[PDB]
Amino acid sequence: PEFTKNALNVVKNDLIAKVDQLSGEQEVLRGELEAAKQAKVKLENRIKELEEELKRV
Amino acid sequence: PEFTKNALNVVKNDLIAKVDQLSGEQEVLRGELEAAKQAKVKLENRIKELEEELKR
């Protein structure tokens, strides 16, 4: 009864902590993913600039 | 002239190489995101089951 409730709360809170840890990892990864996406746009625009410059000899 | 063309291509090819590396990083990152998302879903279902058991 008291032991059971206690035990259930202990494991429940363990799992909640694991979820929060994953959420933290997610936020970091999403940040890296956004940074990569923006950096790629810049590079691709620069490649188009260089292709124009090559055309102009 | 030809020296100019070669020089610009060095820069162009380097940028292309960098784009490819970022494409690789994006794919790895997306794979890790999906794994995390799926892991979270499983944890949340386990938490829900425990919450329902606590109600009893």
Side-chain angles (χ1 to χ4, degrees), chain B residues 24-36 38-41 43-47 49-50:
Chain B
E25 290 179 12
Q26 282 178 317
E27 182 164 338
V28 174
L29 288 167
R30 283 177 188 128
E32 290 174 332
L33 264 313
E34 185 59 28
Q38 289 180 25
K40 268 174 82 179
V41 169
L43 284 163
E44 300 260 44
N45 290 342
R46 286 166 66 192
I47 290 159
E49 293 268 355
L50 290 165

Side-chain angles (χ1 to χ4, degrees), chain A residues 50 54, chain B residues 4 6-16:
Chain A
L50 278 143
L54 280 161
Chain B
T4 304
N6 299 340
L8 294 181
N9 275 320
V10 170
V11 182
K12 187 186 77 156
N13 288 329
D14 178 77
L15 295 172
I16 291 168

Side-chain angles (χ1 to χ4, degrees), chain A residues 4-6 8-9 11-12 15-16 18-19 22-23 25-27 29-30 32-33 35-36 39-40 43-44 46-47 50-51 53-54, chain B residues 1 4 6 8-9 11-12 15-16 18-19 22-23 25-27 29-30 32-33 35-36 39-40 43-44 46-47 50-51 53-54:
Chain A
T4 300
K5 171 179 171 62
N6 179 23
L8 287 166
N9 278 315
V11 62
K12 175 178 112 299
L15 299 187
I16 290 171
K18 290 177 179 294
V19 169
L22 283 168
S23 292
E25 296 168 17
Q26 279 181 318
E27 292 182 28
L29 295 170
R30 287 198 196 96
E32 297 178 19
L33 183 53
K40 216 168 88 164
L43 288 174
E44 278 161 350
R46 279 286 296 144
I47 288 167
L50 278 143
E51 285 168 345
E53 291 170 1
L54 280 161
Chain B
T4 304
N6 299 340
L8 294 181
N9 275 320
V11 182
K12 187 186 77 156
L15 295 172
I16 291 168
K18 283 174 164 58
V19 172
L22 286 171
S23 297
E25 290 179 12
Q26 282 178 317
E27 182 164 338
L29 288 167
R30 283 177 188 128
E32 290 174 332
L33 264 313
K40 268 174 82 179
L43 284 163
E44 300 260 44
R46 286 166 66 192
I47 290 159
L50 290 165
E51 283 170 349
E53 186 64 27
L54 272 166

